[PDB]
Amino acid sequence: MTDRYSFSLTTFSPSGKLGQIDYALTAVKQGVTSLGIKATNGVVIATEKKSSSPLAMSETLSKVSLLTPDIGAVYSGMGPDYRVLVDKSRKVAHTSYKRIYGEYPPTKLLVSEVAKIMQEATQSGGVRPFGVSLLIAGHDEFNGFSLYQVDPSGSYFPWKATAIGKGSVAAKTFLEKRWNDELELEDAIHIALLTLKESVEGEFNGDTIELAIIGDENPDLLGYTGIPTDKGPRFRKLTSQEINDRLEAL
Amino acid sequence: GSRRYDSRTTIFSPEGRLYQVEYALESISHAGTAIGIMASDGIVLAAERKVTSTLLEQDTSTEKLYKLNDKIAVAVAGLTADAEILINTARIHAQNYLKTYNEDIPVEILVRRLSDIKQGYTQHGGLRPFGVSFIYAGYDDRYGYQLYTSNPSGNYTGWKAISVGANTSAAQTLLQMDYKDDMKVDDAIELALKTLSKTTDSSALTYDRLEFATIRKGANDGEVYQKIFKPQEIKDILVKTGIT
Amino acid sequence: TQQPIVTGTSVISMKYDNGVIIAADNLGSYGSLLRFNGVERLIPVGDNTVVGISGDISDMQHIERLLKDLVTENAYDNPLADAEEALEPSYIFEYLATVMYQRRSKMNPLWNAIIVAGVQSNGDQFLRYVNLLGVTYSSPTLATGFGAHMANPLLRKVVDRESDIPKTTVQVAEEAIVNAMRVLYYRDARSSRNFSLAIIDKNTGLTFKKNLQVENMKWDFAKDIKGYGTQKI
Amino acid sequence: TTTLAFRFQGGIIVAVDSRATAGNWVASQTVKKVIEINPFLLGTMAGCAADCQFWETWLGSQCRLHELREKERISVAAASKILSNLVYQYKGAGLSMGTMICGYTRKEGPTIYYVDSDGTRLKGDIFCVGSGQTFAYGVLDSNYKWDLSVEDALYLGKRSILAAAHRDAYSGGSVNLYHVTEDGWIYHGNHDVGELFWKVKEEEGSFNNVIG
Amino acid sequence: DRGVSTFSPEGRLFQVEYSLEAIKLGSTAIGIATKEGVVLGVEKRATSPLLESDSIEKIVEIDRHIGCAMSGLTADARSMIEHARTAAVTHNLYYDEDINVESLTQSVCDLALRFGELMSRPFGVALLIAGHDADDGYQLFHAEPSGTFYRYNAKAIGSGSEGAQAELLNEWHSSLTLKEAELLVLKILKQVMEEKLDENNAQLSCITKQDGFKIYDNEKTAELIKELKEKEAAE
Amino acid sequence: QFNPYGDNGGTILGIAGEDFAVLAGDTRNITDYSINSRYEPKVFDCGDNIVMSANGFAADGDALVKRFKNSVKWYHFDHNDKKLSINSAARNIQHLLYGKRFFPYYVHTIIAGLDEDGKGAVYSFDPVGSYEREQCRAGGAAASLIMPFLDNQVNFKNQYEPGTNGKVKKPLKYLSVEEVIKLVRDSFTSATERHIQVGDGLEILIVTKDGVRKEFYELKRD
Amino acid sequence: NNYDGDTVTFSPTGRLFQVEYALEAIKQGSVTVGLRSNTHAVLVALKRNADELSSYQKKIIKCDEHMGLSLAGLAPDARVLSNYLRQQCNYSSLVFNRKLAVERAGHLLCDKAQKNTQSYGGRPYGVGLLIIGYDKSGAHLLEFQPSGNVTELYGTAIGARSQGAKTYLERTLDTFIKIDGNPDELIKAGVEAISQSLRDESLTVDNLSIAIVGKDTPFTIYDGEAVAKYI
Amino acid sequence: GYDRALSIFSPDGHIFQVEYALEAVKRGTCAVGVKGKNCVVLGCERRSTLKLQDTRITPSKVSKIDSHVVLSFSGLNADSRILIEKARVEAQSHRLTLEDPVTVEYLTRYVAGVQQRYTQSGGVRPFGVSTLIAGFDPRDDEPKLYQTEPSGIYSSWSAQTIGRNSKTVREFLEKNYDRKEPPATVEECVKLTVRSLLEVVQTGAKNIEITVVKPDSDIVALSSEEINQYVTQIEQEKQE
Numbered sequence A: 001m002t003d004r005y006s007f008s009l010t011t012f013s014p015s016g017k018l019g020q021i022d023y024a025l026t027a028v029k030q031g032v033t034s035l036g037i038k039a040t041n042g043v044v045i046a047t048e049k050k051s052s053s054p055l056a057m058s059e060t061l062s063k064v065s066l067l068t069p070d071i072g073a074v075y076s077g078m079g080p081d082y083r084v085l086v087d088k089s090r091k092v093a094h095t096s097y098k099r100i101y102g103e104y105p106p107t108k109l110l111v112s113e114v115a116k117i118m119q120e121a122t123q124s125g126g127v128r129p130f131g132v133s134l135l136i137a138g139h140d141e142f143n144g145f146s147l148y149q150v151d152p153s154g155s156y157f158p159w160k161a162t163a164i165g166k167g168s169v170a171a172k173t174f175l176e177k178r179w180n181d182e183l184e185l186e187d188a189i190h191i192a193l194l195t196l197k198e199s200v201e202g203e204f205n206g207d208t209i210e211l212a213i214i215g216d217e218n219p220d221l222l223g224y225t226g227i228p229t230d231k232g233p234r235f236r237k238l239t240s241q242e243i244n245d246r247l248e249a250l
Numbered sequence B: 001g002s003r004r005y006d007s008r009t010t011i012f013s014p015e016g017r018l019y020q021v022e023y024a025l026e027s028i029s030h031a032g033t034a035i036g037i038m039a040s041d042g043i044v045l046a047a048e049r050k051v052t053s054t055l056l057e058q059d060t061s062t063e064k065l066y067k068l069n070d071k072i073a074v075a076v077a078g079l080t081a082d083a084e085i086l087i088n089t090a091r092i093h094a095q096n097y098l099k100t101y102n103e104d105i106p107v108e109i110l111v112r113r114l115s116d117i118k119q120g121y122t123q124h125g126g127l128r129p130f131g132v133s134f135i136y137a138g139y140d141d142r143y144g145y146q147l148y149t150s151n152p153s154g155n156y157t158g159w160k161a162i163s164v165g166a167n168t169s170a171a172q173t174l175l176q177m178d179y180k181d182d183m184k185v186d187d188a189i190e191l192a193l194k195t196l197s198k199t200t201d202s203s204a205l206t207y208d209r210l211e212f213a214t215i216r217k218g219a220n221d222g223e224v225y226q227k228i229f230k231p232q233e234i235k236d237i238l239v240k241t242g243i244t
Numbered sequence C: 001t002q003q004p005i006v007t008g009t010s011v012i013s014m015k016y017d018n019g020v021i022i023a024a025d026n027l028g029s030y031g032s033l034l035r036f037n038g039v040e041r042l043i044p045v046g047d048n049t050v051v052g053i054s055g056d057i058s059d060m061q062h063i064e065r066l067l068k069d070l071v072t073e074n075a076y077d078n079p080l081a082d083a084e085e086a087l088e089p090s091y092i093f094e095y096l097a098t099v100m101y102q103r104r105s106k107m108n109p110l111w112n113a114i115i116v117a118g119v120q121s122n123g124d125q126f127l128r129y130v131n132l133l134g135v136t137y138s139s140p141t142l143a144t145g146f147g148a149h150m151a152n153p154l155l156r157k158v159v160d161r162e163s164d165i166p167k168t169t170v171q172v173a174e175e176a177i178v179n180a181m182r183v184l185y186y187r188d189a190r191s192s193r194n195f196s197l198a199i200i201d202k203n204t205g206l207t208f209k210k211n212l213q214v215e216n217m218k219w220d221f222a223k224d225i226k227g228y229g230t231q232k233i
Numbered sequence D: 001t002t003t004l005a006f007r008f009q010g011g012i013i014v015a016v017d018s019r020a021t022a023g024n025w026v027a028s029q030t031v032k033k034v035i036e037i038n039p040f041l042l043g044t045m046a047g048c049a050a051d052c053q054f055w056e057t058w059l060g061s062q063c064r065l066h067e068l069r070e071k072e073r074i075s076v077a078a079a080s081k082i083l084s085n086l087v088y089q090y091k092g093a094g095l096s097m098g099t100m101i102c103g104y105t106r107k108e109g110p111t112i113y114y115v116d117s118d119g120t121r122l123k124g125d126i127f128c129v130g131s132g133q134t135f136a137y138g139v140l141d142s143n144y145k146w147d148l149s150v151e152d153a154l155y156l157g158k159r160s161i162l163a164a165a166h167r168d169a170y171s172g173g174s175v176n177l178y179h180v181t182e183d184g185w186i187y188h189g190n191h192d193v194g195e196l197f198w199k200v201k202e203e204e205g206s207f208n209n210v211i212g
Numbered sequence E: 001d002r003g004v005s006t007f008s009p010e011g012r013l014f015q016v017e018y019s020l021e022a023i024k025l026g027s028t029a030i031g032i033a034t035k036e037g038v039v040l041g042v043e044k045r046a047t048s049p050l051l052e053s054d055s056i057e058k059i060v061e062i063d064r065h066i067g068c069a070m071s072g073l074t075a076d077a078r079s080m081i082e083h084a085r086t087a088a089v090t091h092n093l094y095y096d097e098d099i100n101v102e103s104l105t106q107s108v109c110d111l112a113l114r115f116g117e118l119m120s121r122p123f124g125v126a127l128l129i130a131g132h133d134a135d136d137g138y139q140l141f142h143a144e145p146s147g148t149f150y151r152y153n154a155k156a157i158g159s160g161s162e163g164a165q166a167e168l169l170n171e172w173h174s175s176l177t178l179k180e181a182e183l184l185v186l187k188i189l190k191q192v193m194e195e196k197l198d199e200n201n202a203q204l205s206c207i208t209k210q211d212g213f214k215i216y217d218n219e220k221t222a223e224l225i226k227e228l229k230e231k232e233a234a235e
Numbered sequence F: 001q002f003n004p005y006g007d008n009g010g011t012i013l014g015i016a017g018e019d020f021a022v023l024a025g026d027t028r029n030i031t032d033y034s035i036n037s038r039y040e041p042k043v044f045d046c047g048d049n050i051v052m053s054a055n056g057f058a059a060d061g062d063a064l065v066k067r068f069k070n071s072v073k074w075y076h077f078d079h080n081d082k083k084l085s086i087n088s089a090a091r092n093i094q095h096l097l098y099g100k101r102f103f104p105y106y107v108h109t110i111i112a113g114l115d116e117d118g119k120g121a122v123y124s125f126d127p128v129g130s131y132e133r134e135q136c137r138a139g140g141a142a143a144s145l146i147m148p149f150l151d152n153q154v155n156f157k158n159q160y161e162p163g164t165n166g167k168v169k170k171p172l173k174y175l176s177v178e179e180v181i182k183l184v185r186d187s188f189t190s191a192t193e194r195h196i197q198v199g200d201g202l203e204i205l206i207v208t209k210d211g212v213r214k215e216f217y218e219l220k221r222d
Numbered sequence G: 001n002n003y004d005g006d007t008v009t010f011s012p013t014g015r016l017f018q019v020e021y022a023l024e025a026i027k028q029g030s031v032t033v034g035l036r037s038n039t040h041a042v043l044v045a046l047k048r049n050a051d052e053l054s055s056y057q058k059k060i061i062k063c064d065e066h067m068g069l070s071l072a073g074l075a076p077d078a079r080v081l082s083n084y085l086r087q088q089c090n091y092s093s094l095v096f097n098r099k100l101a102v103e104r105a106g107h108l109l110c111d112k113a114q115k116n117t118q119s120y121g122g123r124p125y126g127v128g129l130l131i132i133g134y135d136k137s138g139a140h141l142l143e144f145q146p147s148g149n150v151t152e153l154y155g156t157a158i159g160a161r162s163q164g165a166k167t168y169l170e171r172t173l174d175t176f177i178k179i180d181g182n183p184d185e186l187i188k189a190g191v192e193a194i195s196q197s198l199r200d201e202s203l204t205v206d207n208l209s210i211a212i213v214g215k216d217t218p219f220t221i222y223d224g225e226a227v228a229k230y231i
Numbered sequence H: 001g002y003d004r005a006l007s008i009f010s011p012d013g014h015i016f017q018v019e020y021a022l023e024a025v026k027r028g029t030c031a032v033g034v035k036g037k038n039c040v041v042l043g044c045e046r047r048s049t050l051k052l053q054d055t056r057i058t059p060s061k062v063s064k065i066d067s068h069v070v071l072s073f074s075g076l077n078a079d080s081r082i083l084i085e086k087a088r089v090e091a092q093s094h095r096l097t098l099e100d101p102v103t104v105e106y107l108t109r110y111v112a113g114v115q116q117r118y119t120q121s122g123g124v125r126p127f128g129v130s131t132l133i134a135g136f137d138p139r140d141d142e143p144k145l146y147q148t149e150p151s152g153i154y155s156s157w158s159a160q161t162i163g164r165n166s167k168t169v170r171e172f173l174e175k176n177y178d179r180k181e182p183p184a185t186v187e188e189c190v191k192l193t194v195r196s197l198l199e200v201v202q203t204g205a206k207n208i209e210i211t212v213v214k215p216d217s218d219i220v221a222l223s224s225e226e227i228n229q230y231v232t233q234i235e236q237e238k239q240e
């Protein structure tokens, strides 16, 4: 018994390709489109809620996840792989940072920790790479707002705006035309909804779209009062109603 | 059992080569070119970013050039994720040495240890090697300014000027042509950029597709300063040499 | 390192011409408190062995479970479990004696004093002692605790050496045991009137007697005793 | 115990008593406190008999393995250091050993090493170890010269143990003599104190404290 | 590929059988047992004339009463000898006596099959273990990487083994003297060796009760070589 | 606090002749002021003409004897039924005892038999493994009473030749088995008189080239 | 074919080829015979030599005073298994003061051999054993196969040409079973049994190996001039 | 842990992984060892496809294991560092317990033992390195030169070469080296070593390294000009 697979399942081919990483990226390509846009006073991340069945309650399945009060994540590719990554990402934010410094990690460093986990699945014994690409949007005091992409290889890049998955090629072209360095958050949400309509085929409403922002602090969502320095989470998930309001003035 | 699926990453070919090391080097040859040039009064590190997108955030980005300590930096060529694993090890190794001896680590010692780690992955453990080649640029009070390179085999060597990644053959010929020993930093800056500009697979070399860094004694009196160039500073140095 | 909590007192025994007798009272003391009164400290293993245990009762219950498990394990893949390959007293003893010494050597003893009484397959009488230290010894008469001090002297008047065993009948031997139990009730402050007695004979087999009582006690002479010396009234 | 060994012109003298104690109980009078490790190496014993006996026999096994592996007799320095490194591993556990590794090799010449159970290892020309070491030192130091003859040196070593055997209550029995030269060790007999004392008293005229 | 501890259809361990082929490539080693002693002799086989032949150590001491000769991948023998030496000395420590030659061999052979997926492969070397004890007298053992050992009156291992073994079959009798055995090893070695036999490319040794295990000098072996040539020419 | 050791009393005695050896020991077993057994043997035939006794703490003594008996068994298996010599057994026992140097067997051990030249041999051990061959040795509770008597009667200590002005010692000589058994019996009766842990019975094991014979004698039971 | 790479693989017909190949190593081994009466049990083993200069491979091993076996196949594997038996016999003595039953001895060998046939990396034992013994239920004879299968028998034989001796014993069953209180006659029957497996070679003084255990007889092996009586 | 038996026997009785490790040695730059009457000299090839090198800081081919013993090699450079490190540690460990520096035979035997262990250990490949170990035993003036190889065998040599085109330089040494009369002086020994490398090297510029070891921890490396003088002298005598 015991894990006898103590050797790498991802290896270099004669051409220099890492097969399993390439194939993991192929799995991401098949995945549903998700995107992220950075504004001057915020960041927006969005994706389509592909329902497996109309009997299934798509509210119970959350593609956009809170990692810290000021950091959120969305993906394209294999959902289960994403789910466990979010669990590990939330925990590493505490163990390797908050329990040491008494504050949440900045976006770039949390991203770095998630990348490390995905890189190890590329080299460690008896495991395949993760079949997902992440888009991590976040804010911190000294770096401001930021948006990062994390690939199966463990590589990560910062973006002004980008898209991943099914119709990423067309979506990226759309974002290049619309993006400028003076975009306000509401303008970025508007563009996000426009970009996403191109890739979505069926219904396009607040129940089939999942969208969250990293913006101003939300004292109402904090849960308590009395500490002036604690002002609430910058991560907010837009409600089904809040999306439909913006779809009328589209 | 599991024997069926073992690639056997740490074995010899009939010719006496390490398959995985050779294939990792083939991987690195497609990575963005990185150049190191050592002058008498400093060191230059120049690196070309891999096909950039216009919506990539350029100023808050780090792909090629990394800081190991205040006196030593590296240029990367290969898998960034792999490089970061090795960089954090190298950063820790430097601090261990400082903690033990109350002295900054000599460049070669840091390079040797990082290279020894790579070597281990080629001889035992059954894991794939790190698909990374480094250019180490650093200073210590024994040998002064030093350039090294290491590759997946775990073999390292010292250089006056060197390139890694893509088009090293063409790049090394151009460096070998124009390099001389009494060279200054500002001249080396110009050589580094001119070499990339000719060996680049892109149409034209621009500020947004470059990372640049210098290690001078250009601080105030007998002390070393690391300068990781900002986007606007690369834009200016590119105009100053007359490439754009 | 332990300290005994709920305890059992003396266990006494002796050999006779055809077999062995063993006895022990039914008390579970909690220090000076005579807490439990329905405790059986004689545990039969098969139809040819009885293990009498004194000392810590929690450790006694542990040993009960080991012996119970030993019978089960011996029955496994053993067609002669109730015949030639049945458990002997000598097997049961050596097992316990091994355990007792292993536990003392790990500085975590079973706080007990054990006497294994039985009859071997060839008719030979078996009687041997073992305690928390792993110390073992055999004798025509064996006893634990206060029994060693008060019972053995009485039982040795009947069987003083090996040659006295064939001369001793079961009627004589049982009478001596029952007398000894009375003497212990007079003098042991952690003893009870109620007790159990077991006879393992090579002909009649195992006879287990429960709910016996000490009787024919001399208390009458107490009425004449006054004060501690000079007191006439 | 009382054991000594000193270096001189004609090599090394080694002398020991033969008593074993268990408190004030005399456990033995005929004990061997010198171990012949090889034809050129000796080891003296003092302290816990079992520790001395067990670990010095073990030392001999290690010295044998050395000459098998290296095709060369082990040095006195290396032999002593095996033992000292061993007892240092057990430091604090309660070993009680007072030892002297005496021998000859080409590269070293005649050499003596003191090794004890608290890890002390010392090279030197003269050592006395045991409960009666002080009594032996008194006689040995006051009569010692480098230019002693083999005959005189043998006697001084014998006389020094006798002195301690007399005064020290935990020393006695008999004297075991050895002489180490470039050709190896040479045994110079067992000398019972029961006879040796009176023989020395009469011939030497010493021990005037005793009733003749 | 395939498991290291796999059986062939004929009922043999592949790796053990392949290691036997490696031993056939090795240099010749011969042993002969008499009532006056056991003789061990080997072919040194220097790969080049610049190589100092006296550094070729293919005959080895285990204890004073036990010697050993090897053939095959001789680098593999180092840990086997180390174990044998420790086993011999350890037994002397525990029991204050010399260890039986058979018991020593059995201890070495216990390492043999401690391989699999313990070490990664069997040993690629065969050993001739010669010695003497008080019980069974002068003995010669052939220890293989299979874990098996046979006692022999005489035995040859290595490249010229089957030819030399057939020669030993005819020549050996129960009344051989030590001197007769010495010459017999030299005679048979000279026959199977490629290069011409002399004191520099061949080595003799013996174990006797009185003097223990002794490797012969190049001066002593040279005289036995000269004595051998004269005796063959004499009839 | 739990005390893992106990004292089961008794005493043992070994004497060596020219072509024989005896190992005697009383059969009494005690704890504190109580008698556990009047006949509990502690001198055992361990095979290969070796007799052994480990006196002191019985549980440790029984464990040691049991381990040595098992050591003899495996010596046969591992070395082609070779006979374990008395000198080799002694060394083996040292290692058994010293293996528990920091949690000792509380016993004084004695073994007896014949050496490889056929002569009688007695080896004695301390609790942690130190050993020595001797002609004579007493061990256990009454060893302090018996041992000096043996020094006088077996090795003729302090005995000089009459009329020689205390200059010539009484010459050493081997004793007959009949003389040795007289000394053993007198030694134990004397020890029984003045030591409360000694009595009940005496069991002697005599070892010759023909094998191991036993002799039993009653001792005072008070 | 494709299902004989390791012991962990079943064939399409439900066979374990590595176990069968281990069984094949026994057939290549030299013949050995086992038989018993009600009072005694006897092992007779034909020893094999490398050549005339070599010794004859010892086939019989003692496990306890009342038990032992003979081997056929890989001798080192027999040494491992015999050593395991020695320990189990010895555990029974030290802990329970009880001689290990010959039946339990078989059960323990079966379970030890089985674990090697179900796990990756390991291999089956390459040897067959004939265990004889005398315990509380009289004389016994067992046949161990490295598949794990252990079998109690009146008589049997394993090794090359073992079918000749096995047929003879099957005929002689009624005769030799009642050889009670007579060691030499039970051995004679065993020596005559092993003779049915001989081809070209005959039983010599340093070739034959006999062992016996019984009511008042410890397990003892006879070699050399001690077996000259039975030729 | 990774357990795979990488070094295993083949039907013909060969361990291919060990034999393929020898091919890596054959690929490596040439290294030569020649021992004289009172010295040993270690010569090493350095391939000239690498210009723009920094020879100050580039790892030297000959490494000091202790003050009295040196080690050169042929084969994989990264592998050699591991052997050198282990050897250096064992050298200090020997001084610590035996109170005496290692003999050249002992140090060789240790290095060879490490190489052998990697041929029958699970999860590891053999070292693709053969070494030349040279020096002088403590308080001894007899020169010592030993060779090791991936299999683990080691032996003493009057003179020996390893690496690429080593069979050519071994041919040269076999006729030019006299056993009865080895190079009597340092100059003679260095010249014979340089001569032997000039059969294979190319140019005698910055392609040849020479290290001279003499008794009592006397080790020195020759500079370019010093070596170039031997190259100049040999060529002028050749034209005859």
Ligand SMILES: *[C@@](C)(CO)[C@](*)(O)[C@H](Cc1ccccc1)NC(=O)[C@H](Cc1ccc(OC)cc1)NC(=O)[C@H](C)NC(=O)CN1CCOCC1
Residues within 6 Å of the ligand: D001, D002, D019, D020, D021, D022, D023, D027, D031, D032, D033, D045, D046, D047, D048, D049, D050, D052, D053, D096, D130, D131, D170, D171, F104, F126, F127, F128, F130
């Ligand atoms: C003189 C006589 C002073 O005692 C010597 O040191 C002598 C040396 C010696 C060496 C080899 C053989 C015999 C004698 N030492 C003793 O006789 C020694 C004294 C001693 C006892 C205990 C010690 O601490 C552990 C230190 C010194 N005596 C003994 O060893 C006696 C024979 N045995 C015991 O005391 C048994 N103990 C030893 C400690 O562990 C528990 C059992």
Ligand SMILES: [Mg+2]
Residues within 6 Å of the ligand: F191, F192, F193, F194, F195, F196, F197, F198, F199, F220, F222
């Ligand atoms: Mg009394």
Ligand code: NA
Residues within 6 Å of the ligand: D001, D021, D131, D170
């Ligand atoms: Na003392």
